[PDB]
Amino acid sequence: DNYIYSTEVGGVGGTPFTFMQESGTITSIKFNWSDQYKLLHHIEVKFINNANIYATGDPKGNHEVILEIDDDETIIGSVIGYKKGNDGRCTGVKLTTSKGKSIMAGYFEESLITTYTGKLAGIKGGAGSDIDRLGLIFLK
Amino acid sequence: NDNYIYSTEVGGVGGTPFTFMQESGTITSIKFNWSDQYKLLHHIEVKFINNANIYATGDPKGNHEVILEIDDDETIIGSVIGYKKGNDGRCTGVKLTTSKGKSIMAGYFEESLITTYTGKLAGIKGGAGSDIDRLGLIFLK
Amino acid sequence: DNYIYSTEVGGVGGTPFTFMQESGTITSIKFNWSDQYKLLHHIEVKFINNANIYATGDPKGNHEVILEIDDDETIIGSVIGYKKGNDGRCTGVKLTTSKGKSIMAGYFEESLITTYTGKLAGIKGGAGSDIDRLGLIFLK
Amino acid sequence: DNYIYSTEVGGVGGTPFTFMQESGTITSIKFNWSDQYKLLHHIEVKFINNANIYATGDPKGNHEVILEIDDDETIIGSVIGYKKGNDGRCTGVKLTTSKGKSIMAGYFEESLITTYTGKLAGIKGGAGSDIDRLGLIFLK
Amino acid sequence: DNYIYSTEVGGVGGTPFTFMQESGTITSIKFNWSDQYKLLHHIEVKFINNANIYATGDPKGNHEVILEIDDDETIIGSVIGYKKGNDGRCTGVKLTTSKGKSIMAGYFEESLITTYTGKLAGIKGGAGSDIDRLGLIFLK
Amino acid sequence: DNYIYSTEVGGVGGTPFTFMQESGTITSIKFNWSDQYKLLHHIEVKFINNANIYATGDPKGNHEVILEIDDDETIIGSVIGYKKGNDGRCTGVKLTTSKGKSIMAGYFEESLITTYTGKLAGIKGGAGSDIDRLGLIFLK
Amino acid sequence: NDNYIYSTEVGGVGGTPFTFMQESGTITSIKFNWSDQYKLLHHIEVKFINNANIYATGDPKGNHEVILEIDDDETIIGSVIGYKKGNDGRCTGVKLTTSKGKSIMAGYFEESLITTYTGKLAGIKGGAGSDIDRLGLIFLK
Ligand SMILES: OC[C@H]1O[C@H](O[C@@H]2[C@@H](O[C@@H]3[C@@H](O[C@H]4[C@@H](O)[C@H](O)[C@@H](CO)O[C@@H]4O)O[C@H](CO)[C@@H](O)[C@@H]3O)O[C@H](CO)[C@@H](O)[C@@H]2O)[C@@H](O)[C@@H](O)[C@@H]1O
Ligand SMILES: OC[C@H]1O[C@H](O[C@@H]2[C@@H](O[C@@H]3[C@@H](O[C@H]4[C@@H](O)[C@H](O)[C@@H](CO)O[C@@H]4O)O[C@H](CO)[C@@H](O)[C@@H]3O)O[C@H](CO)[C@@H](O)[C@@H]2O)[C@@H](O)[C@@H](O)[C@@H]1O
Ligand SMILES: OC[C@H]1O[C@H](O[C@@H]2[C@@H](O[C@@H]3[C@@H](O[C@H]4[C@@H](O)[C@H](O)[C@@H](CO)O[C@@H]4O)O[C@H](CO)[C@@H](O)[C@@H]3O)O[C@H](CO)[C@@H](O)[C@@H]2O)[C@@H](O)[C@@H](O)[C@@H]1O
Ligand SMILES: OC[C@H]1O[C@H](O[C@@H]2[C@@H](O[C@@H]3[C@@H](O[C@H]4[C@@H](O)[C@H](O)[C@@H](CO)O[C@@H]4O)O[C@H](CO)[C@@H](O)[C@@H]3O)O[C@H](CO)[C@@H](O)[C@@H]2O)[C@@H](O)[C@@H](O)[C@@H]1O
Ligand SMILES: OC[C@H]1O[C@H](O[C@@H]2[C@@H](O[C@@H]3[C@@H](O[C@H]4[C@@H](O)[C@H](O)[C@@H](CO)O[C@@H]4O)O[C@H](CO)[C@@H](O)[C@@H]3O)O[C@H](CO)[C@@H](O)[C@@H]2O)[C@@H](O)[C@@H](O)[C@@H]1O
Ligand SMILES: OC[C@H]1O[C@H](O[C@@H]2[C@@H](O[C@H]3[C@@H](O)[C@H](O)[C@@H](CO)O[C@@H]3O)O[C@H](CO)[C@@H](O)[C@@H]2O)[C@@H](O)[C@@H](O)[C@@H]1O
Ligand SMILES: OC[C@H]1O[C@H](O[C@@H]2[C@@H](O[C@H]3[C@@H](O)[C@H](O)[C@@H](CO)O[C@@H]3O)O[C@H](CO)[C@@H](O)[C@@H]2O)[C@@H](O)[C@@H](O)[C@@H]1O
């Protein structure tokens, strides 16, 4: 494609999602998580030139974080926390941008991926009550 | 919209809506009032370049205030708003860092956070009553 | 004007002062404060090409600090501590210059202003036994 | 050659492996380890333009970490923790990249190697239930 | 003049001194102080191309510090500690140079001046048993 | 020579060694040490274009560290810990390279040398059960 | 004098005078010995470039030593000597920092200090017996 697909980490459960838009990049991303379950539960994404909110999961966590991304702003550091195996889950995400902005959502107590970097174009994975699995998508 | 970038308004749906914005103008001063009692922002005042008027919203009942004065060439390079999410949400805190290494920290960051768009601060929008129900920043494009 | 007026922070009390000189900038500023009251009590300013000391307040504090400012030296960082409201006071001042000089006077327990920056031209406010309120004045 | 072979550290046990691809570099590396044994147990590698997973060891650890490596991204810092001698094992790996990405797997309580640096081309060693020994391979 | 006169800080007591030499700058300065009185007691200065030691005060303190200054070396940071008022004294001096050298003499428990900076040309003040008052002198 | 010989630090005991190779530099160095004796016991060196391991001492320590050195990589900081006198020993070595790699072996509770720096060409000293004395050798 | 800068000799008037200097030579190595018992320097050794001789003064009775090796192009950019002042004075400590980021710290800094001239270290001068009574550094002009 014109795209780099980072590994989807977590389990095989939930309903698949792919959030990507032709000629579009992510302008906003929101992560919801709980202290009760130490999991991500819900993600929302907006793309440039598109008022629609693309949402997956169940927003039942007691915390959320939003990162807004300027048009020229890239991801220079990216860590996803997860529980591995078929019954796995995403537990946490840390993003750092080319403008020194960062967010930290959830927990990093089991497994980690340090992903590919670049301009964040989309996300892919599976979600039900929780985020079962998450992979980032970048421009080439 | 072709001149402005609207950061997400974070917090609840309550209070009276406000938009503090002036044509050809940017914010020269912003004041945040907050309480240790409620751990909320209660009151915001803004001045714009070439305008002696003070634009105020909320109830200045907090025991703390912070003022940031912004030089004409000074931009926001880092911006975090703390809030309680949901319909009955509130803004709890704001942290701003400028291109000249100035910063302010008001209030509390214990629940939800937004790391916003950056640039030249043109205005603010949201809702306020006794508290700041919700706050969104506005930047020049 | 030729001048930028920073917000006067503190209360409405004391006797007004405005210390400014045409074609002049502050060459020296002195702050007097007490541990007993945790307030500024007295300020003195000198201007270039002027031997006069312009003083306001009551110099009853147990501490003073002086900053001398070279002709080409600007203020790049300025924080004033104060108690807000009609019965407010200035409690503290921190200044940092373009030559890496700094001073710290008094206390920062309640409210703070981070002011405009530039060439320090004057001060304005009110003073009696204490510094009720203080605003810095810069060259435009 | 076109390759720099870092010292294989650990013991003489397990089944030998050499994972390298001519005109290929590692795009992804995964380390599995346990708190129970404080050892690495399993490694997987993928090469650019190749969906096949090269795996060695037994993935029985309770933790894994993945590092994804951009095509232009090199290793600038590399530490392997191991137990020395014939009955040795690899206990840990830390990698830092030219883009400021890092991973840390396992434990560093006995012996350490700080390896050669450069573009990670492959791995070599021996593995059974555990990673007995590991050496990194770089482009010249 | 060719000179910048920093404020003399401390009291009105002791015998006046001015140490300056035409076309000359300070090559060496020594400060003597006591733990008993927490005051400066004695200062000695040497100038380039001049073997004479210029001394004032009474060298009765239990500590001394010497700063030697290279011909091209300027003062980039200067703080004098003092007790304010007519019966004041100098308690301390801190100097930092353009070559990253620094000295710290005495105590800074009451009042402070952050002085003008530049090439140290001389000193002026009053001294008896102690240093009553001190001002630095720089080239323009 | 073409060589700078750092001071051999430690005692006069053990069997002398000199590890150098014409037109060669050290590509790998290993230090073995014990918590029991808080001494270095054994050193191994490899040179570029030479598969031979040059070893001295007795590898009886419970720890080892290896530093691999890229062909263009120099030592920018070097500290050797030792026990002084005729019955002295080397207790520790810390090396930092031009690529930001470092190793720390053993203990620094007694004496220290901060050595010459540059391209590490060889080592010289004496060794028996312990490393009695160690000196580094650099290119001019 | 047309080739050398003499830093002040600090400490007392006691011990046997020494001057360690070699024409067209600079210090390639310097060793300081000191004690926790007396909190003094006791012994100094110096080597010069192109000279296998060790120049030593004092009594090496301290429980600590440090050595600084100096590359031919390496200068001193920071230098502090700790001492006890007066006729019966002593050197208690030395701290050196080089143009290549090397440093040593020997002994104690509890009484008096000199921050010296900087440059290429050519030699040392002073007095020594059981202790280092006094020490002055010598630099190339
Ligand atoms: O901006 C927020 C709302 O402001 C207006 O509504 C006001 C709001 O004020 C209450 C009030 O709560 C009191 C206690 O009942 C409460 O338990 C305690 C919190 O521990 O705080 C007070 O003692 O004030 C708090 C703190 O400022 C407010 O956060 C809280 O919402 O609601 C009151 C109840 O309806 C109302 O009387 C006030 O006028 C209003 O503009 C609304 O639309 C805003 O959302
Ligand atoms: O600039 C500040 C004001 O100065 C003038 O008023 C002065 C003000 O001084 C008081 C005084 O407080 C002390 C006692 O007076 C007080 O009763 C006590 C207990 O409440 O606390 C202190 O001991 O001094 C302090 C320290 O200077 C001041 O902070 C405090 O405001 O009030 C005095 C008596 O009412 C008055 O005599 C003083 O002259 C005046 O210019 C006023 O306008 C200014 O705001
Ligand atoms: O990679 C290492 C070796 O793997 C293969 O052999 C395996 C090896 O496994 C043992 C085993 O030890 C467990 C118990 O068997 C042991 O008695 C107990 C004592 O404290 O500790 C463990 O519970 O598993 C551990 C954990 O992985 C290993 O560290 C340990 O080596 O040995 C087994 C029998 O001796 C063998 O059956 C296993 O397959 C083999 O390929 C060998 O060459 C490798 O070195
Ligand atoms: O003859 C000595 C100097 O006289 C003039 O200086 C005066 C001199 O007075 C000192 C002073 O000493 C006391 C304290 O002030 C001092 O701080 C303390 C510790 O040093 O020790 C004494 O207690 O004052 C007493 C007065 O009681 C005098 O007897 C004594 O000579 O020193 C003062 C501090 O520098 C100074 O202020 C005085 O003017 C001066 O003219 C000088 O030439 C003489 O050497
Ligand atoms: O052979 C005599 C030495 O003479 C010259 O040096 C004298 C010498 O005096 C010391 C000194 O020792 C005590 C303390 O002063 C010392 O600091 C401490 C730790 O070293 O140990 C002793 O307590 O004085 C004693 C007697 O009071 C002498 O016996 C002893 O030798 O060393 C002094 C310090 O350097 C020096 O100032 C003296 O001039 C010198 O020629 C030396 O080589 C001789 O050994
Ligand atoms: O994404 C998680 C899962 O959601 C759906 O299964 C749900 C699951 O909920 C469990 C538990 O797995 C979850 O962590 C906690 C907190 O969110 O809730 C429940 O404890 O399983 C329960 C019961 O089996 C279901 O009620 C619930 O739907 C489903 O879409 C699945 O595919 C997905 O993996
Ligand atoms: O390199 C040290 C020493 O080695 C040889 O002497 C050995 C030495 O062992 C002692 C003690 O020196 C050492 O710290 C520990 C740990 O290695 O072991 C022993 O307690 O001294 C013993 C005497 O008992 C020797 O037999 C032993 O071989 C020798 O090559 C010597 O020259 C060298 O300094």
CATH number at residue E82: 2.100.10.30
User: Do the Cβ atoms of E34 and E63 come closer than 8 Å?
Assistant: yes
Q: Which ligand is nearest to the CA of B17?
A: 1
What CA–CA distance (Å, rounded) separates E70 from G118?
A: 8
Rounded to the nearest whole angstrom, what is the distance from the C-alpha of residue B86 to the centroid of ligand 1?
Answer: 16
**Is C63 in Cβ contact with E115 (below 8 Å)?**
no
Q: A22 Cβ partners below 8 Å, 6+ apart? A: none
Residue from G1, G2, G80, G85 to probe the interface with E (highest E Cβ count within 10 Å): G85
Q: C80 Cβ partners below 8 Å, 6+ apart? A: C9, C90, C92, C93, C112, C113, C115, C134, C136
Q: What DSSP string describes C39-89?
A: SEEEEEEEETT----EEEE----SEEEEEE--TT--EEEEEEEEE-STT-E
User: Do the Cβ atoms of E138 and E116 come closer than 8 Å?
Assistant: yes
Rounded to the nearest whole angstrom, what is the distance from the C-alpha of residue F128 to the centroid of ligand 7?
Answer: 7
How many CA atoms within 13 Å lie on the side-chain side of E110?
Answer: 17
What CA–CA distance (Å, rounded) separates B57 from B21?
A: 13
What CA–CA distance (Å, rounded) separates D29 from D57?
A: 14
Resolution in units of Å? 2.0
C-alpha E77: how far from chain center: 13
What is chain F's length? 140
Buried b (16+ CB within 10 A) or exposed e, E18-38: ebbbeeebbbbbbbbbbeebb
In A, minimum Cα distance to B96 occurs at A101
What CA–CA distance (Å, rounded) separates B47 from B53?
A: 7
Rounded to the nearest whole angstrom, what is the distance from the C-alpha of residue C14 to the centroid of ligand 7?
Answer: 84
What CA–CA distance (Å, rounded) separates A45 from A66?
A: 10
Q: Identify the CA nearest to G5 among candidates G66, G79, G55, G58.
A: G79
Q: B112 Cβ partners below 8 Å, 6+ apart? A: A63, A64, A65, A66, B10, B82, B83, B84, B85
**F120 shares contact with chain G (CB less than 8 Å):** no
Nearest CB among A68, A99, A101 relative to B8 is that of: A68
Q: D51 Cβ partners below 8 Å, 6+ apart? A: none
Residue from F75, F76, F84, F96 to probe the interface with G (highest G Cβ count within 10 Å): F84
- Chains F and G make contact, 3+ CB pairs within 8 Å: yes
What CA–CA distance (Å, rounded) separates G25 from G74?
A: 13
DSSP F52: P
Sign of the torsion formed by the C-alpha atoms of D13, D18, D19 and D25: positive
How many CA atoms within 13 Å lie on the side-chain side of B54?
Answer: 9
What CA–CA distance (Å, rounded) separates F139 from F121?
A: 6
In F, minimum Cα distance to D98 occurs at F99
Buried b (16+ CB within 10 A) or exposed e, B22-40: beeebbbbbbbbbbeebbb
Sign of the torsion formed by the C-alpha atoms of D60, D64, D69 and D75: negative
Q: What DSSP string describes A61-93?
A: -SEEEEEE--TT--EEEEEEEEE-STT-EEEEE
Residue with tokens 């090469």: D47
Residue with tokens 């700790």: G82
Residue with tokens 């390298």: D20
What CA–CA distance (Å, rounded) separates C100 from D120?
A: 45
The neighbours of chain G, by the rule of 3 or more Cβ pairs under 8 Å, are E, F
Question: β-strands D102-106, C120-127: how paired?
Answer: unpaired
Closest Cα in chain C, distance from residue B40 (Å): 16
Q: Identify the CA nearest to F58 among candidates F127, F139, F137.
A: F127
Query: Which residue from F33, F83, F110, F129 has its CB within 8 A of the most atoms of ligand 7, so it is best to mutate?
Result: F129
What CA–CA distance (Å, rounded) separates D60 from D36?
A: 10
What CA–CA distance (Å, rounded) separates E13 from E127?
A: 7
User: Do the Cβ atoms of F16 and F56 come closer than 8 Å?
Assistant: no
What CA–CA distance (Å, rounded) separates C102 from E107?
A: 18
Strand partners, D118: D75
Domain count, chain G: 1
What CA–CA distance (Å, rounded) separates C50 from A120?
A: 61
- Chains D and F make contact, 3+ CB pairs within 8 Å: yes
Q: F45 Cβ partners below 8 Å, 6+ apart? A: F19, F26, F28, F29, F30, F53, F54, F55, F122, F123
What CA–CA distance (Å, rounded) separates F109 from F107?
A: 6
- Is G117 near ligand 5, meaning CB less than 6 Å away? no
Q: How was this structure determined?
A: X-ray
**Which two tokens mark E39?**
């005051």
How many CA atoms within 13 Å lie on the side-chain side of F68?
Answer: 23
Q: What is the residue range of D14's domain?
A: 3-139
**Is A113 in Cβ contact with D68 (below 8 Å)?**
yes
What CA–CA distance (Å, rounded) separates D45 from D123?
A: 8
